[PDB]
């Protein structure tokens, strides 16, 4: 029995879209607390019976890459911090410390002698060193896919459980640049009870501070019942540093950062050593700060973080921080007139205390739905820039996301011999991808050399996945009686037509066929999705005279197109030595399908040939053996249709102007246009973080560009060489695919945007997704500057009136908006000469060619059951969801390396159940190595919610044979929540559930 997530609108105290509408966002000088007010408390609030309980929580913010690489930071800082944490906590039993980034902690702990490891275990066992979140990293929450958020969590917690027998239930996220409700969603399904956040808009901090709504029960925007709710603490002030964590006046709080006496206080009053001669006056000053902070919160329990970036490095910082705070605590606790108990504490300690206060009925907490984007730290400094910064690696994230899913799924079907090194490869791949989830990784907010490290690590991870996938496929499709593997040998190379993209790197392999050299070639397609899929696939072939069969030698209809490249005035050139064979692979759920490419004399029976039309003035171009000559013509408008699918009209610069859905229905206008944003000459400069445009975007001079039109029975495309962008519309008989080869070059202080202009009556309403999990209603707010109407576009955005919807699906996270009724726009790249003064200490001048990929879905929704007009969520159609699925998890292509393949079977997984379209097996992962008694395999099942507009049961517990046991688990697989006999019940719309099947 499942919630309805469409018709029922949840009741919450704070709904962030609603709050945003009714908020003035006035940037008033508030006093010592610049972005709030002068806090008052009644001092008779406190007495011997109602005391203020103060937890002072030492911490050290450790970036796994930012100004330095992971390994640079490890050697310069983090190993010294964790060594000293070990020593000082051992010697000082009341001293406490929290640690978030398990990537750094695993690096450290594995390097320890056995004595140190057991000393480390003792300070974690007695709760002195407490792990918070326990993720590999503290992830980005804007650009990150929920799958990779769960991956990095799963990897840090699995490491903590294996090596420290602990699983944190309190999250600490002090640095991500705005906050997603995806985090509570995953954490609450991973056994968490509490989470803390910091970087929310100063006007939101003020508004919530005023109603003491900084602690709230954060539920998903669709959850009527509140089962998703997680207790959230929002910190009230500008920073997580010591000046902004003691209370409202940083000039006072900075005096209680005892490390600042080659560091100083900006407010020019230094810390002073605490003595019997000044402790009374210092404690008065400090407790006054504490009691002002407590006014903003509903319990008599107060959280005081004590730290900053890479703090607790030197042994004397540990002494000076600990000893001075001891003296203060000694004085304050001994002196009844304060009515304070103050002590070193952990985050869990804080939350426990707050819950005890809730139980005792001391406080009742408000409910909240929504997100905390776009973040502004002051004035108009909105952090929408990093939604696009380093878009190459943003793209690379999504490709590696898929290769890790595919590698884990393919290698999961079987136990492997350790000589195969499957587990080594998958651990490397998970960890490089996990590291990139860091809030200076996927964000593009790291120094040039660190981005290079991230790229080289993800490159290595891609090669590890390829090796696992090709080994796996060879095993799945070779006769058992023949299968005799060389675990070091390349049986298949992978073909990927979308990463990096030919035009970024000309690196795809050409299958070389000859009547004598080599007449045929086995190819295999993998389908990670759990339903039958039929998708056009392509390969490079050395002859255009190629025919496709399955292994059973049934002909398959195919099309051959030329291989086109673009060069510098920007014009295409065709190959005379390679061709694209295009055909429809039918692949089973979570399955494999084999096909054969065979050469012939001449045009084979079942292979068509695309025409080519080169629209320019002053035309010519050979194509070797390509049997249809390249035609020429002057720039002009062009219509194209593939299959019964839509009919697209293109300008004479090869940009979409119109879509006709069906043969009766109208030519709906849909104009693609490239524009620029610039940087402010005066005042605040755009950087890796901040988007600060000098006014609305201004159109790009296109000139007369060369337009290439390729027309074929299975696939046609319109390509054009614009300055900065080779734009391409590909048609295969449904929603078209948009490809931009973006080369911003050295156009300093430029942001290239792509805008869609329709007559859709959207108004001020658009929808953007969070972490590729949910779509959230946005409202353009004219009261906020442009950069504040920019939101993350991690996997899609859409506009709609009562009749029409346009959805743009992305293969990469980029920033975007709807800045006017019937518009969508999405930034492609940004080049920025200036730093934006958030500590990166450079601009963005390392741009490189990236191939961005999209699907464009124009649909009628007048017949779709749309949620209440008051609902803060949107839901994709089946067609838009399947289009996102085609971008993020396409079919994998495998070319057999060797001349002959004995044992070859033509299919795997034909028996596998084809689950409802809204269901996905997000994760298949074998949880046990071979040496193990009982093999265990984890499945994450996510079910989305599709808009209804008028399939076999999938039980993952049975996918593998000899199932002995089957548990519903936390999403990390670390805790059993339910023994099941051993059927997994399917999951509600917008729900995610994990299961582990055991095998005898
Ligand atoms: Zn950070």
Cβ neighbours around 17 below 10 Å, total: 17
Cβ neighbours around 140 below 10 Å, total: 30
Question: Residue 160 C-alpha to ligand 1 middle, in angstroms?
Answer: 21
Cis peptide before 524 (omega within 30 of 0): no
Question: Residue 65 C-alpha to ligand 1 middle, in angstroms?
Answer: 9
Question: Residue 136 C-alpha to ligand 1 middle, in angstroms?
Answer: 13
Alpha carbon distance 255, 367 (integer Å)? 36
Give the DSSP letter of residue 244.
G
Query: In the numeric block, which tokens belong to residue 201?
Result: 């808009």
Helix (H) or strand (E) run with residue 790 in it: none
- DSSP output for 683-698: SPPP-SS---BSSS-E
- Residue 671 CB partners (closer than 8 Å, separation 6+): 651, 655, 656, 657, 756, 757, 758
SS3 301: strand
Question: Residue 497 C-alpha to ligand 1 middle, in angstroms?
Answer: 35
Tell me the binding residues for Zn(2+).
Answer: 61, 63, 175, 439
Phi/psi region, residue 348 (left: phi>0; alpha: psi -120 to 50; beta: rest), is alpha
Question: Residue 444 C-alpha to ligand 1 middle, in angstroms?
Answer: 13
Q: What is the 3-state secondary structure (H, E, C) of 461-494?
A: HHHHHHHHHHHHHHHHHCCCCCCCCCCCCCCEEE
Cα angle vertex 186, ends 181, 190, to 5°? Answer: 145
Q: Are 393 and 458 in contact (CB under 8 A)?
A: yes
Alpha carbon distance 50, 295 (integer Å)? 14
Tell me the binding residues.
Answer: 61, 63, 175, 439
β-pairing verdict for 52-61 and 301-309: parallel
Cα–Cα distance list, 83 to 91, 258, 312 (Å): 13, 20, 10
Solved with: X-ray
Cα–Cα distance list, 354 to 302, 328, 366, 608 (Å): 9, 23, 14, 71
Domain 491-610+890-911 annotated CATH 2.60.40.1180: yes
Q: Is 13 a catalytic residue?
A: no
Question: Residue 383 C-alpha to ligand 1 middle, in angstroms?
Answer: 14
Expressed in Å, this structure's resolution amounts to: 2.1
SS3 106: helix
β strands within 801-881, DSSP E: 804-810, 814-817, 823-831, 850-860, 873-874
Question: Residue 135 C-alpha to ligand 1 middle, in angstroms?
Answer: 14
Question: Residue 434 C-alpha to ligand 1 middle, in angstroms?
Answer: 15
SS3 904: coil
Give the DSSP letter of residue 197.
E
Question: Residue 308 C-alpha to ligand 1 middle, in angstroms?
Answer: 10
Superfamily of domain 380-490: Glycoside hydrolase family 38, central domain (1.20.1270.50)
Q: Specify the fold of 611-889.
A: Beta-galactosidase; Chain A, domain 5 (2.70.98)
β-pairing verdict for 230-234 and 301-309: unpaired
Residue with tokens 């450290």: 108
Domain 1-379 annotated CATH 3.20.110.10: yes
Question: Residue 143 C-alpha to ligand 1 middle, in angstroms?
Answer: 15
Which residue in 77, 140, 175, 257 is the catalytic one?
A: 175
Question: Residue 148 C-alpha to ligand 1 middle, in angstroms?
Answer: 18
Question: Residue 779 C-alpha to ligand 1 middle, in angstroms?
Answer: 30
Half-sphere exposure of 355 (CA within 13 A, CB side): 12
Q: Are 653 and 672 in contact (CB under 8 A)?
A: no
Cβ neighbours around 554 below 10 Å, total: 11
- Residue 180 CB partners (closer than 8 Å, separation 6+): 141, 142, 144, 371, 372, 373, 770, 771
β-pairing verdict for 750-757 and 823-831: antiparallel
Cα angle vertex 173, ends 169, 178, to 5°? Answer: 135
Task: Give the start-to-end residue ranges of the domains of the chain.
Answer: 1-379, 380-490, 491-610+890-911, 611-889, 912-1000
Pick the CATH number of 912-1000 from 1.10.1040.50, 2.60.40.1360, 3.40.50.300, 3.90.1150.10: 2.60.40.1360
Residue with tokens 């934006």: 836
Alpha carbon distance 97, 306 (integer Å)? 9
Question: Residue 213 C-alpha to ligand 1 middle, in angstroms?
Answer: 25
Domains 491-610+890-911 and 912-1000 agree in fold: yes
Alpha carbon distance 748, 334 (integer Å)? 62
Burial of 515 from C-beta contacts in 10 A (0-12 / 13-18 / 19+)? exposed
């Amino acid at each position: 029995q499942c919630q309805d997530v469409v018709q029922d609108v949840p009741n919450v105290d704070v709904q962030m879209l609603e709050l945003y509408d009714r908020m003035s966002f006035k940037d008033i000088d508030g006093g010592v607390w610049k972005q709030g007010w002068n806090i008052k408390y009644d001092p008779l609030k406190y007495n011997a019976h109602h005391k203020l309980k103060v937890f002072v929580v030492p911490h050290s913010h450790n970036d796994p890459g930012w100004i330095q690489t992971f390994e640079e930071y490890y050697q310069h800082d983090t190993k010294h911090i964790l060594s000293n944490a070990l020593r000082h906590l051992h010697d000082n039993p009341e001293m406490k410390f929290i640690w978030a980034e398990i990537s750094y902690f695993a690096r450290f702990y594995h390097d320890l002698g056995e004595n140190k490891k057991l000393q480390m275990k003792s300070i974690v066992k007695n709760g002195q060193l407490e792990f918070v979140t326990g993720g590999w990293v503290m992830p980005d929450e804007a650009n990150s896919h929920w799958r990779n958020v769960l991956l990095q969590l799963t990897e840090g917690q699995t490491w903590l459980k294996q090596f420290m027998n602990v699983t944190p239930t309190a999250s600490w996220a002090i640095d991500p640049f705005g906050h997603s409700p995806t985090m509570p969603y995953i954490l609450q399904k991973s056994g968490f009870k509490n989470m803390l956040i910091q970087r929310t808009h100063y006007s939101v901090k003020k508004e919530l501070a005023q109603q003491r709504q900084l602690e709230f029960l954060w539920r998903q925007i669709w959850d009527n019942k509140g089962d998703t709710a997680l207790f959230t603490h929002m910190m009230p002030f500008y920073s997580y540093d010591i000046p902004h964590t003691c209370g409202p006046d940083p000039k006072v709080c900075c005096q209680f950062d005892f490390k600042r006496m080659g560091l100083s206080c900006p407010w020019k009053v230094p810390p002073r050593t605490i003595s019997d001669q000044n402790v009374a006056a210092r404690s008065d000053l400090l407790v006054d700060q504490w009691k002002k902070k407590a006014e903003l919160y509903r319990t008599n329990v107060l959280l005081i973080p004590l730290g900053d970036d890479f703090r607790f490095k030197q042994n004397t910082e540990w002494d000076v921080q600990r000893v001075n705070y001891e003296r203060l605590f000694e004085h304050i606790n001994s002196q009844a007139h304060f009515n304070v108990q103050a002590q070193f504490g952990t985050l869990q300690e804080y939350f426990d205390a707050v819950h005890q206060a809730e139980r005792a009925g001391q406080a009742e907490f408000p409910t909240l739905s929504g997100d905390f984007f776009t973040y502004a730290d002051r004035s108009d400094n909105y952090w929408s820039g990093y939604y696009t910064s380093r878009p190459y690696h943003k793209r690379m994230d999504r490709v590696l996301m898929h290769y890790v899913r595919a590698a884990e799924m393919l290698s999961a079907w079987h136990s492997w011999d350790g000589m195969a090194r499957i587990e080594e490869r998958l651990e490397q791949a998970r960890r490089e991808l996990s590291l990139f989830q860091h809030h200076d990784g996927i964000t593009g907010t790291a120094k040039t050399h660190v981005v290079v490290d991230y790229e080289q690590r993800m490159q290595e991870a891609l090669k590890a996945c390829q090796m696992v996938m090709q080994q796996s496929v060879y095993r799945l499709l070779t006769k058992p009686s023949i299968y005799s593997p060389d675990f070091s040998f390349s049986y298949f190379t992978l073909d990927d037509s979308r990463w990096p993209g030919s035009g970024v790197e000309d690196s795809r392999t050409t299958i070389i066929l000859g009547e004598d050299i080599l007449p045929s070639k086995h190819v295999v397609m993998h389908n990670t999705l759990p339903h039958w899929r039929e998708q056009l696939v392509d390969f490079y072939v050395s002859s255009p005279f190629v025919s496709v069969t399955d292994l059973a030698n049934n002909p398959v209809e195919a099309q051959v197109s030329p291989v086109w490249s673009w060069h510098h005035t920007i014009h295409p050139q065709g190959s005379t030595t390679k061709y694209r064979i295009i055909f429809k692979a039918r692949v089973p759920p979570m399955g494999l399908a084999t096909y054969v490419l065979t050469i012939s004399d001449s045009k084979p029976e079942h292979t068509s040939y695309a025409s080519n039309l080169l629209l320019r003035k002053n035309p010519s171009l050979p194509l070797g053996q390509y049997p249809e000559d390249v035609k020429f013509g002057d720039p002009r408008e062009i219509s194209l249709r593939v299959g019964n699918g839509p009919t697209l009209a293109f300008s004479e610069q090869g940009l979409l102007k119109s879509i006709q859905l069906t043969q009766d229905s109208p030519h709906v206008p849909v104009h693609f246009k490239f524009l620029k944003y610039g940087v402010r000459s005066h005042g605040d400069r755009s950087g890796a973080y901040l988007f600060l445009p000098n006014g609305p975007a201004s159109p790009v001079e296109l000139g007369q560009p060369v337009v290439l039109v390729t027309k074929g029975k299975l696939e046609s495309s319109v390509s054009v060489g614009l300055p900065s962008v080779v734009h391409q519309t590909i048609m295969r008989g449904g929603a078209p695919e948009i490809r931009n080869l973006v080369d911003i070059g050295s156009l300093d202080n430029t942001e290239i945007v792509m805008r869609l202009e329709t007559h859709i009556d959207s108004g001020d309403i658009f929808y953007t997704d969070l972490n590729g999990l949910q779509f959230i209603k946005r409202r353009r707010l004219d009261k906020l500057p442009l950069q504040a109407n920019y939101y993350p576009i991690p996997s899609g955005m859409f506009i709609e009136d009562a009749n029409t919807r346009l959805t743009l699906l992305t293969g990469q996270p980029l920033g975007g908006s709807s800045l006017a009724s019937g518009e969508l726009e999405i930034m492609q790249d940004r080049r920025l000469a200036s730093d934006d003064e958030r500590g990166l200490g450079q601009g963005v001048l390392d741009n490189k060619p990236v191939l961005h990929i999209y699907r464009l879905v124009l649909e009628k929704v007048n017949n779709c059951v749309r949620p209440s007009e008051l609902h803060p969520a949107g839901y994709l159609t089946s067609a838009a969801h399947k289009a996102s699925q085609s971008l993020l998890d396409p079919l994998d292509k495998f070319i057999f390396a060797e001349n002959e393949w004995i044992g070859a079977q033509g299919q795997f997984g034909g028996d596998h159940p084809s689950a409802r379209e809204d269901l996905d097996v997000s994760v298949m992962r074998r949880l046990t190595k071979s040496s193990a008694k009982t093999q265990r395999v984890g499945y994450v099942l996510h079910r989305t919610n599709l808009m209804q507009c008028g399939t076999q049961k999938l039980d993952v517990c049975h996918l593998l044979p000899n199932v002995a046991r089957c548990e519903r688990t936390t999403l990390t697989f670390l805790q059993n929540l339910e023994h099941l006999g051993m059927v997994a019940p399917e999951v509600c719309p917008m729900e995610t559930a994990a299961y582990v099947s055991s095998h005898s």
